[PDB]
């Protein structure tokens, strides 16, 4: 990262203007900035250093190393990273399509084939991550973005703040991730690996098909219990119109034991992902309505 040059020397943005703010998070704020030299529109992630403990700062530096190691079409590319005496500035490629789940609910047509295109992009990005021994650890709809408000815009995964680098096989990296997408191995606090990402994909794919998560419980202890014992189902009637290929793919992605869980490469070679005509074609309006309820529920 550039510790000598100021972000404000290479990029232009008024951090005080409201119309510059792309996103407001609890630990950072993402503004729309413009490359002074090239005119490229970018999303800078501003992180004040003020109240930050050392663990948080090194978490950020970890995110910078990992994000710089990653150059893939379906990963939001970090252009450059800056650190001055008060702020981190993580410049990223501009992403204007918003969250994937916020856009699916606005589609007039959505079927398993669309869900398979999304999952294909997510899986390919994950294949690039795991190839470099990177575990995202926190895959969730908030991290699944669309590059543009255009149809057929690419899905890009993002937010590697919780990402870890696995050097020596299954390793304990701590208990992190959002509860609904936590892998059983992480809940058990045993050493884990890239398989945890696969787990989240399963949970995500499930949602992509029906609009509600397989593990939903307000009590996080009963939720972690459901995840450990792999207590989920395909309720009628929503799942009766789903291909058994998708159902089997989710059953595989949600394998309670990481050793029996497919790698992302194996998933990318699954017929529901690789064959353009295995996923169902019928429009799933119920998935869209349930997904509006879901999007509403997670924010609140």
XYZ file of C-alpha atoms in Angstrom:
300
model
C 0.000 0.000 0.000
C 1.028 3.619 -0.666
C 2.145 5.034 2.676
C 3.926 8.072 1.173
C 1.494 9.438 -1.426
C -1.845 10.866 -0.354
C -5.046 9.366 -1.696
C -6.184 12.966 -2.185
C -3.213 13.552 -4.494
C -4.243 10.807 -6.943
C -8.018 10.778 -6.412
C -10.599 13.541 -6.058
C -13.594 13.360 -3.720
C -15.392 15.656 -1.287
C -15.834 13.400 1.742
C -18.223 16.004 3.211
C -20.740 15.966 0.353
C -23.681 13.613 0.829
C -24.035 12.676 -2.855
C -20.508 11.221 -2.791
C -21.354 8.532 -0.220
C -21.878 5.150 -1.870
C -22.235 3.252 1.401
C -22.354 3.809 5.170
C -20.903 1.041 7.332
C -20.108 0.857 11.029
C -16.345 0.642 10.464
C -15.903 2.446 7.134
C -17.630 4.753 4.679
C -17.499 4.218 0.916
C -17.445 7.356 -1.250
C -17.480 7.810 -5.011
C -14.129 9.277 -6.075
C -12.493 10.056 -9.410
C -8.913 9.318 -10.433
C -7.286 12.719 -10.918
C -5.065 11.426 -13.717
C -7.176 8.864 -15.590
C -10.723 10.029 -14.848
C -11.677 6.532 -13.718
C -14.664 6.477 -11.365
C -13.842 4.495 -8.223
C -15.262 3.609 -4.819
C -12.890 4.644 -2.040
C -13.400 2.878 1.294
C -12.438 5.424 3.959
C -11.507 4.016 7.374
C -10.658 6.465 10.144
C -7.816 5.177 12.326
C -8.975 7.102 15.421
C -10.604 4.595 17.787
C -9.063 1.551 16.083
C -7.312 -1.031 18.217
C -4.260 -2.765 16.772
C -6.250 -5.890 15.878
C -8.612 -3.880 13.667
C -5.772 -2.062 11.888
C -3.994 -5.333 11.147
C -7.297 -6.786 9.994
C -7.413 -3.908 7.510
C -3.819 -4.468 6.367
C -4.698 -8.140 5.906
C -7.651 -7.086 3.761
C -5.280 -4.933 1.701
C -2.792 -7.730 1.087
C -5.505 -10.208 0.134
C -7.389 -7.700 -2.027
C -4.181 -6.844 -3.864
C -3.472 -10.550 -4.417
C -6.867 -10.906 -6.148
C -7.328 -9.986 -9.818
C -10.524 -11.595 -11.125
C -13.502 -10.452 -13.172
C -15.995 -11.419 -10.444
C -14.023 -9.923 -7.547
C -14.310 -6.174 -6.953
C -10.755 -5.145 -7.790
C -8.851 -2.952 -5.351
C -7.057 -0.411 -7.538
C -4.767 0.922 -4.802
C -4.627 1.304 -1.030
C -3.435 4.305 0.973
C -2.628 4.995 4.610
C -1.886 8.421 6.037
C -1.742 9.606 9.656
C -5.498 9.360 10.251
C -7.194 7.301 7.544
C -7.043 4.235 5.369
C -8.223 4.753 1.791
C -8.989 1.530 -0.080
C -9.687 2.495 -3.692
C -11.824 -0.098 -5.499
C -13.277 -0.413 -8.970
C -16.641 1.302 -9.183
C -19.627 -0.974 -8.592
C -23.032 0.589 -9.243
C -25.477 -2.313 -9.502
C -25.949 -2.716 -5.774
C -26.529 -5.953 -3.926
C -27.578 -8.919 -6.075
C -30.514 -9.775 -3.812
C -31.810 -6.203 -3.941
C -31.856 -6.466 -7.751
C -33.355 -9.937 -8.179
C -36.496 -8.747 -6.362
C -36.900 -6.078 -9.061
C -36.703 -8.534 -11.977
C -39.823 -9.382 -13.946
C -38.305 -12.782 -14.767
C -36.092 -14.900 -12.530
C -35.512 -18.637 -12.817
C -32.988 -21.282 -11.830
C -30.898 -20.413 -14.890
C -30.379 -16.868 -13.605
C -29.571 -18.250 -10.154
C -27.072 -20.585 -11.820
C -25.433 -17.692 -13.661
C -25.074 -15.799 -10.383
C -23.772 -18.875 -8.583
C -21.439 -19.582 -11.484
C -19.860 -16.141 -11.153
C -19.650 -16.412 -7.352
C -18.117 -19.878 -7.650
C -15.549 -18.809 -10.249
C -14.444 -15.880 -8.091
C -14.201 -18.310 -5.170
C -12.116 -20.659 -7.320
C -9.678 -17.805 -7.871
C -9.641 -17.085 -4.136
C -9.166 -20.683 -2.972
C -6.529 -21.244 -5.663
C -4.563 -18.551 -3.820
C -5.385 -20.171 -0.440
C -7.762 -17.333 0.469
C -10.877 -18.004 2.561
C -13.442 -15.199 2.316
C -15.124 -16.483 5.528
C -17.972 -13.953 5.255
C -19.942 -14.652 2.075
C -23.390 -13.050 2.326
C -25.795 -11.114 0.066
C -24.205 -7.867 1.253
C -20.940 -9.000 -0.381
C -22.561 -10.108 -3.673
C -22.702 -6.989 -5.840
C -23.595 -6.166 -9.429
C -21.088 -4.170 -11.467
C -23.768 -1.972 -13.046
C -27.513 -1.398 -13.090
C -27.422 -2.969 -16.552
C -29.057 -6.369 -17.141
C -26.530 -9.179 -17.538
C -24.100 -7.167 -15.415
C -21.503 -9.407 -13.747
C -21.788 -10.499 -10.141
C -18.724 -9.475 -8.129
C -17.890 -10.597 -4.592
C -16.341 -8.092 -2.207
C -15.468 -7.210 1.408
C -12.431 -9.376 2.249
C -12.028 -7.800 5.696
C -12.689 -11.171 7.338
C -10.673 -13.001 4.669
C -7.808 -15.197 5.860
C -4.872 -16.897 4.155
C -4.650 -20.650 4.750
C -1.001 -21.735 4.562
C -0.962 -25.203 6.169
C -4.282 -26.913 5.515
C -7.193 -26.737 7.974
C -6.376 -24.032 10.515
C -8.260 -22.148 13.220
C -8.756 -18.536 12.115
C -11.251 -17.596 14.841
C -15.030 -17.436 15.042
C -16.149 -14.927 12.401
C -18.873 -14.554 9.800
C -22.548 -13.725 9.889
C -24.593 -16.309 11.813
C -26.974 -17.428 9.062
C -24.091 -18.369 6.751
C -21.715 -19.828 9.351
C -20.281 -23.235 8.543
C -20.678 -25.991 11.150
C -16.896 -26.285 11.476
C -16.598 -22.613 12.420
C -19.438 -22.914 14.935
C -17.656 -25.927 16.451
C -14.511 -23.715 16.530
C -12.428 -26.480 14.948
C -9.726 -25.746 12.338
C -11.366 -25.000 9.007
C -10.455 -24.284 5.395
C -11.944 -23.064 2.109
C -14.910 -25.438 2.524
C -16.549 -22.828 4.772
C -17.027 -20.571 1.747
C -18.676 -23.495 -0.058
C -21.074 -23.781 2.867
C -22.090 -20.134 2.531
C -22.623 -20.658 -1.197
C -25.081 -23.432 -0.386
C -26.944 -21.155 2.002
C -26.864 -18.445 -0.662
C -27.954 -20.772 -3.463
C -30.891 -21.966 -1.339
C -32.019 -18.358 -0.943
C -31.502 -17.710 -4.665
C -34.028 -20.468 -5.361
C -36.795 -19.812 -2.806
C -36.199 -16.444 -1.117
C -35.693 -17.596 2.486
C -32.659 -19.063 4.277
C -32.404 -22.749 5.211
C -31.245 -21.901 8.749
C -33.392 -19.159 10.277
C -33.651 -18.673 14.025
C -33.672 -15.533 16.157
C -31.971 -17.375 19.022
C -28.405 -17.710 17.757
C -27.871 -20.798 19.919
C -30.764 -22.648 18.280
C -29.507 -21.311 14.934
C -25.997 -22.657 15.505
C -27.652 -25.902 16.617
C -29.588 -26.081 13.334
C -26.375 -25.456 11.404
C -24.318 -28.045 13.302
C -26.948 -30.775 12.928
C -27.641 -29.612 9.341
C -31.354 -29.195 10.134
C -32.883 -27.778 6.958
C -35.403 -29.025 4.421
C -37.023 -28.395 1.059
C -40.599 -27.472 2.055
C -43.497 -27.862 -0.349
C -44.777 -26.224 -2.477
C -41.871 -23.868 -3.219
C -39.335 -26.656 -3.747
C -41.638 -28.941 -5.744
C -40.943 -26.799 -8.827
C -37.157 -26.858 -8.271
C -34.906 -29.182 -10.251
C -33.551 -32.110 -8.277
C -30.172 -31.045 -9.682
C -30.308 -27.817 -7.691
C -31.557 -29.678 -4.606
C -28.688 -32.165 -4.840
C -26.202 -29.339 -5.406
C -27.381 -27.623 -2.217
C -27.299 -30.914 -0.300
C -23.669 -31.250 -1.395
C -22.700 -27.653 -0.605
C -24.347 -28.072 2.823
C -22.431 -31.216 3.765
C -21.871 -31.040 7.556
C -18.320 -32.448 7.245
C -15.846 -30.367 5.198
C -13.993 -33.434 3.908
C -17.167 -34.723 2.227
C -17.894 -31.192 0.962
C -17.133 -30.405 -2.688
C -14.361 -28.035 -3.576
C -15.297 -25.011 -5.654
C -13.767 -26.648 -8.752
C -15.965 -29.725 -8.309
C -18.936 -27.376 -7.889
C -18.035 -25.533 -11.098
C -18.155 -28.938 -12.807
C -21.627 -29.730 -11.418
C -24.295 -30.128 -14.140
C -26.531 -27.459 -12.587
C -23.636 -24.963 -12.908
C -21.770 -26.027 -16.061
C -24.669 -27.121 -18.291
C -26.749 -24.199 -19.525
C -29.964 -26.269 -19.673
C -29.951 -28.303 -16.441
C -31.332 -25.490 -14.208
C -35.058 -24.912 -14.322
C -36.588 -22.368 -16.669
C -39.939 -21.496 -15.080
C -40.222 -18.059 -13.485
C -40.235 -18.207 -9.666
C -42.378 -15.270 -8.563
C -42.791 -16.800 -5.098
C -39.007 -16.661 -4.752
C -39.160 -12.952 -5.592
C -41.870 -12.125 -3.033
C -40.263 -14.225 -0.305
C -36.984 -12.556 -1.249
C -38.517 -9.109 -0.707
C -39.550 -10.318 2.746
C -35.999 -11.631 3.287
C -34.266 -8.422 2.188
C -36.638 -6.562 4.498
C -35.891 -8.897 7.404
C -32.083 -8.781 7.344
C -31.848 -4.969 7.398
C -34.225 -4.772 10.364
